[PDB]
Amino acid sequence: SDAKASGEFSVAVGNGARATEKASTAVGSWAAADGKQSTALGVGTYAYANASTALGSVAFVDNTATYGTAAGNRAKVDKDATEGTALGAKATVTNKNSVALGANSVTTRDNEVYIGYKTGTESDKTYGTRVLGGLSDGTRNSDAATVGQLNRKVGGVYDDVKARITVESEKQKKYTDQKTSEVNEKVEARTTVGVDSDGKLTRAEGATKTIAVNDGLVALSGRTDRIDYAVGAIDGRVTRNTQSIEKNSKAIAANTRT
Amino acid sequence: SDAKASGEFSVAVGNGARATEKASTAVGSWAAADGKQSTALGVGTYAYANASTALGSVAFVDNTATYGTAAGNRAKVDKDATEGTALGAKATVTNKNSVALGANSVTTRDNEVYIGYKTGTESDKTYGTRVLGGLSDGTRNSDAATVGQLNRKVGGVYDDVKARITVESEKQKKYTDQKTSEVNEKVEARTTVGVDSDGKLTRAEGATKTIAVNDGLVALSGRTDRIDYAVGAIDGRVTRNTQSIEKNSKAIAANTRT
Amino acid sequence: SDAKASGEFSVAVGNGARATEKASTAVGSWAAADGKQSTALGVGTYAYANASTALGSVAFVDNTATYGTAAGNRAKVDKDATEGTALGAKATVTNKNSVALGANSVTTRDNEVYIGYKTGTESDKTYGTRVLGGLSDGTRNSDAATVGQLNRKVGGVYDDVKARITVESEKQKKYTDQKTSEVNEKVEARTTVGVDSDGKLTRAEGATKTIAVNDGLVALSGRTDRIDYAVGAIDGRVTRNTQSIEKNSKAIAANTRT
Ligand SMILES: [Cl-]
Ligand SMILES: [Cl-]
Ligand SMILES: [Cl-]
Ligand SMILES: [Cl-]
């Protein structure tokens, strides 16, 4: 039917191609550039929105998707996805200001770059994921962190925590030793007595022989037992002496004359 | 005025289009491909640098930006941005070997991929950011780390640290018990005495009754008090007996005759 | 020789250009679009595979690389790299369903986006890396984590671990104090005696003066020494008294008459 270049500055090349708005360019049979400053390249390629660019056969930018850019066979920026950018065959942008990066890629949120993709004939999953490589370590808060950075950051903190736990355990050992020692000092100061050359108990301070207070008590109690017996035995003797003395006095008096 | 294809192998299509260097291609009214192996597609699209490619109306590659690639309406690779790549409408590359990815995107450093973007009519911020989705977990040090990886790596270390702190606290409990027990063993060994059937103090080892050394001392001191009194009382009696005996002897002698 | 548009819906523009399959479009001298729905733009640009798109002079998609998309001077999707996407001058995709993003970029794995690149005249390294900026914090497990997130996540756990170590050290202090105190209570209960107004030993409970059991034992042993001497001395006296009494009795009897 065409080619028909009806817009100002417009160019249309190929059978059926049409460029119908100002500054539109359509190149490829049946391509259509129906937006202002729109560009369509390839067969059946449609750049319908203002400022849209569709590159590759059957690439598509919806007429509502102002500033949409689609590159690759069947790459698409869909309804309401203003400023969408689809990069790769069969990539699809369905969100504003987002990027579907890679063949078969999709978008899921606005203001997003998405590198996951519609899986084909072999996955139970709806979307597959892509590994992202070739990164320098991020420096800014909004830079991507690498696996290397993650490991080093986590490893460093892990070693620092190991180290702190060590210091604290040593502190607790030292503490218990000093606190336990305090009580041991008291025990030692109060529970021993020195023993003399002749067995006399003395202050433990700088003494040759040393014994425990309980042993000293047992031994001293034994001495007391002996003394206790003797005192009772002597008492009996003294009583009998007294009685005999008074009996002698009486007899002396009787001799004298009573 | 044109179209003018003056370079070797050059092609120019559209009113005013020009392709002026070897292997240049300009397609679109007023497009210009002025670099060697340069390609311009769309109205007013300029590929000025050697090996530059500008795709979409008003896309632009500065003549100094050798190897610059710009795709999307108004996408631009600017002065000195050699090997720049602008992907999306109004994307701008101002750094060497960098990529402005997405509509409105910019670059800030050389050797950078940048997915942040010039914000429009509604932000006090100069640049907005984009969330990046669809990643497989990175495996290499220069791979991107995912949120999933970050959480699992940090969570695992966190649990490991919990576990270590537990082991160490239990070690400190066990330690204090054993150290505190040592002193308790000493206290117990030195501060008790066994008590006999008849009250005799003995070694605490395997004794029926047991008392504390201080109680034993108090009780033994009381016995000593009693003995102390008795010894003094007996002494007085013995003194008086002696005096009476000597008096009797004198009287006996007087009876005898002195 | 050409231009030759021999495919259905095909368009070829430029000397030697050829579009030889259904829905193929070749624009640029010596360009070739030899795939179904293939599109080649620029001088010597080859879109050989079905559904391939090659944009920029010398851009190339291998005939086996179905759905390959290459944008930029010399950008290439190579043998067997089906669904490859090369974005930037001299970018090369050698893996299925992968993206070489940026000038000089490469791919290393299938299902990968790669932003590292072949270094040129000044590196001993084969591949350079690119910093990735402009990210919003990831929310999903497959979102990219930012440096900001990594730091905050790691910092928060680090503070939490600090805090836990503090609590546990305080627990160990409190524990040792209470356990050490228990033994101190026992020591104090068993190792002191009260001293009376008149020196009498009593239970330490609510006493004016207090002394240690070992000191009390030493002092009590000294009293016992004194008593021990006295008992022996008194015994000698009592023996002598007895002997004198019996001698007096004998003399009294002799006086009486024996
Ligand atoms: Cl005694
Ligand atoms: Cl006597
Ligand atoms: Cl007498
Ligand atoms: Cl007489």
Side-chain angles (χ1 to χ4, degrees):
Chain A
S1 64
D2 302 317
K4 177 164 118 291
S6 50
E8 192 182 5
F9 311 138
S10 75
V11 159
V13 173
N15 194 39
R18 81 169 180 262
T20 59
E21 276 301 333
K22 179 171 189 192
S24 60
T25 304
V27 181
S29 303
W30 308 112
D34 292 334
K36 295 175 186 175
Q37 294 189 2
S38 66
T39 302
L41 170 78
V43 173
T45 302
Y46 304 147
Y48 286 154
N50 298 325
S52 63
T53 305
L55 311 162
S57 186
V58 197
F60 178 90
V61 182
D62 193 80
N63 108 97
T64 61
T66 307
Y67 289 114
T69 304
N73 177 267
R74 261 144 64 187
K76 163 173 61 170
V77 174
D78 215 326
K79 180 167 51 56
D80 298 323
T82 47
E83 302 174 303
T85 305
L87 301 169
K90 306 175 279 174
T92 299
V93 175
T94 49
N95 292 93
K96 295 170 187 294
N97 200 40
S98 293
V99 178
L101 177 67
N104 308 287
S105 287
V106 297
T107 62
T108 75
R109 306 211 239 14
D110 296 353
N111 300 319
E112 174 193 59
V113 173
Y114 202 77
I115 68 172
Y117 63 94
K118 290 167 181 142
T119 186
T121 300
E122 86 310 310
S123 293
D124 270 37
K125 28 206 288 183
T126 302
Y127 298 148
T129 56
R130 284 187 175 98
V131 65
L132 176 60
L135 276 62
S136 303
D137 290 347
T139 60
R140 301 174 185 160
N141 290 346
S142 59
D143 286 346
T146 61
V147 177
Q149 283 181 285
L150 158 59
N151 289 346
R152 284 194 310 278
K153 182 82 178 184
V154 169
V157 155
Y158 181 55
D159 297 341
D160 186 79
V161 173
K162 284 174 190 291
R164 288 177 172 271
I165 294 179
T166 289
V167 165
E168 284 303 325
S169 79
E170 294 173 359
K171 270 190 180 64
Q172 290 303 337
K173 142 166 273 64
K174 157 160 280 189
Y175 184 63
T176 64
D177 291 354
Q178 290 151 0
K179 257 268 154 51
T180 201
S181 177
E182 288 175 352
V183 185
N184 184 66
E185 297 296 351
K186 183 178 298 185
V187 177
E188 287 291 357
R190 298 191 194 171
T191 64
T192 75
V193 293
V195 178
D196 246 17
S197 325
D198 22 272
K200 173 184 174 58
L201 298 183
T202 74
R203 269 74 214 193
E205 38 86 22
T208 309
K209 174 97 286 184
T210 236
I211 68 171
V213 287
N214 60 340
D215 291 336
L217 184 59
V218 174
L220 180 59
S221 192
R223 290 176 69 202
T224 306
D225 291 348
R226 178 165 58 258
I227 290 169
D228 222 355
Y229 173 77
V231 167
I234 288 165
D235 171 67
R237 288 160 60 202
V238 174
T239 292
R240 286 190 292 280
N241 279 173
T242 302
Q243 296 163 345
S244 299
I245 291 167
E246 304 193 352
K247 170 57 169 267
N248 282 168
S249 294
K250 186 180 179 180
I252 296 164
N255 279 178
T256 297
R257 210 34 66 187
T258 55
Chain B
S1 64
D2 302 317
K4 177 164 118 291
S6 50
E8 192 182 5
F9 311 138
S10 75
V11 159
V13 173
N15 194 39
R18 81 169 180 262
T20 59
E21 276 301 333
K22 179 171 189 192
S24 60
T25 304
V27 181
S29 303
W30 308 112
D34 292 334
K36 295 175 186 175
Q37 294 189 2
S38 66
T39 302
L41 170 78
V43 173
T45 302
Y46 304 147
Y48 286 154
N50 298 325
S52 63
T53 305
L55 311 162
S57 186
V58 197
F60 178 90
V61 182
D62 193 80
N63 108 97
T64 61
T66 307
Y67 289 114
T69 304
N73 177 267
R74 261 144 64 187
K76 163 173 61 170
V77 174
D78 215 326
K79 180 167 51 56
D80 298 323
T82 47
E83 302 174 303
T85 305
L87 301 169
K90 306 175 279 174
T92 299
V93 175
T94 49
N95 292 93
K96 295 170 187 294
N97 200 40
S98 293
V99 178
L101 177 67
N104 308 287
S105 287
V106 297
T107 62
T108 75
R109 306 211 239 14
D110 296 353
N111 300 319
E112 174 193 59
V113 173
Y114 202 77
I115 68 172
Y117 63 94
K118 290 167 181 142
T119 186
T121 300
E122 86 310 310
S123 293
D124 270 37
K125 28 206 288 183
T126 302
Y127 298 148
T129 56
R130 284 187 175 98
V131 65
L132 176 60
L135 276 62
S136 303
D137 290 347
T139 60
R140 301 174 185 160
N141 290 346
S142 59
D143 286 346
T146 61
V147 177
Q149 283 181 285
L150 158 59
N151 289 346
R152 284 194 310 278
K153 182 82 178 184
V154 169
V157 155
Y158 181 55
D159 297 341
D160 186 79
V161 173
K162 284 174 190 291
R164 288 177 172 271
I165 294 179
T166 289
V167 165
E168 284 303 325
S169 79
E170 294 173 359
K171 270 190 180 64
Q172 290 303 337
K173 142 166 273 64
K174 157 160 280 189
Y175 184 63
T176 64
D177 291 354
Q178 290 151 0
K179 257 268 154 51
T180 201
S181 177
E182 288 175 352
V183 185
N184 184 66
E185 297 296 351
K186 183 178 298 185
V187 177
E188 287 291 357
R190 298 191 194 171
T191 64
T192 75
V193 293
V195 178
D196 246 17
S197 325
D198 22 272
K200 173 184 174 58
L201 298 183
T202 74
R203 269 74 214 193
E205 38 86 22
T208 309
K209 174 97 286 184
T210 236
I211 68 171
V213 287
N214 60 340
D215 291 336
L217 184 59
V218 174
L220 180 59
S221 192
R223 290 176 69 202
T224 306
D225 291 348
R226 178 165 58 258
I227 290 169
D228 222 355
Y229 173 77
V231 167
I234 288 165
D235 171 67
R237 288 160 60 202
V238 174
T239 292
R240 286 190 292 280
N241 279 173
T242 302
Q243 296 163 345
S244 299
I245 291 167
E246 304 193 352
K247 170 57 169 267
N248 282 168
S249 294
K250 186 180 179 180
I252 296 164
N255 279 178
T256 297
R257 210 34 66 187
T258 55
Chain C
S1 64
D2 302 317
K4 177 164 118 291
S6 50
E8 192 182 5
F9 311 138
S10 75
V11 159
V13 173
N15 194 39
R18 81 169 180 262
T20 59
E21 276 301 333
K22 179 171 189 192
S24 60
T25 304
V27 181
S29 303
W30 308 112
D34 292 334
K36 295 175 186 175
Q37 294 189 2
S38 66
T39 302
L41 170 78
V43 173
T45 302
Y46 304 147
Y48 286 154
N50 298 325
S52 63
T53 305
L55 311 162
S57 186
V58 197
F60 178 90
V61 182
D62 193 80
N63 108 97
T64 61
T66 307
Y67 289 114
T69 304
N73 177 267
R74 261 144 64 187
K76 163 173 61 170
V77 174
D78 215 326
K79 180 167 51 56
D80 298 323
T82 47
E83 302 174 303
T85 305
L87 301 169
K90 306 175 279 174
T92 299
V93 175
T94 49
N95 292 93
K96 295 170 187 294
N97 200 40
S98 294
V99 178
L101 177 67
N104 308 287
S105 287
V106 297
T107 62
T108 75
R109 306 211 239 14
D110 296 353
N111 300 319
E112 174 193 59
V113 173
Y114 202 77
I115 68 172
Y117 63 94
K118 290 167 181 142
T119 186
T121 300
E122 86 310 310
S123 293
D124 270 37
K125 28 206 288 183
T126 302
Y127 298 148
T129 56
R130 284 187 175 98
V131 65
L132 176 60
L135 276 62
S136 303
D137 290 347
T139 60
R140 300 174 185 160
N141 290 346
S142 59
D143 286 346
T146 61
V147 177
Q149 283 181 285
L150 158 59
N151 289 346
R152 284 194 310 278
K153 182 82 178 184
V154 169
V157 155
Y158 181 55
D159 297 341
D160 186 79
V161 173
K162 284 174 190 291
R164 288 177 172 271
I165 294 179
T166 289
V167 165
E168 284 303 325
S169 79
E170 294 173 359
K171 270 190 180 64
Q172 290 303 337
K173 142 166 273 64
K174 157 160 280 189
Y175 184 63
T176 64
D177 291 354
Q178 290 151 0
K179 257 268 154 51
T180 201
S181 177
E182 288 175 352
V183 185
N184 184 66
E185 297 296 351
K186 183 178 298 185
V187 177
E188 287 291 357
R190 298 191 194 171
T191 64
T192 75
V193 293
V195 178
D196 246 17
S197 325
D198 22 273
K200 173 184 174 58
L201 298 183
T202 74
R203 269 74 214 193
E205 38 86 22
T208 309
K209 174 97 286 184
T210 236
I211 68 171
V213 287
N214 60 340
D215 291 336
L217 184 59
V218 174
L220 180 59
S221 192
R223 290 176 69 202
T224 306
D225 291 348
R226 178 165 58 258
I227 290 169
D228 222 355
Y229 173 77
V231 167
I234 288 165
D235 171 67
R237 288 160 60 202
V238 174
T239 292
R240 286 190 292 280
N241 279 173
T242 302
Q243 296 163 345
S244 299
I245 291 167
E246 304 193 352
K247 170 57 169 267
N248 282 168
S249 294
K250 186 180 179 180
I252 296 164
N255 279 178
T256 297
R257 210 34 66 187
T258 55

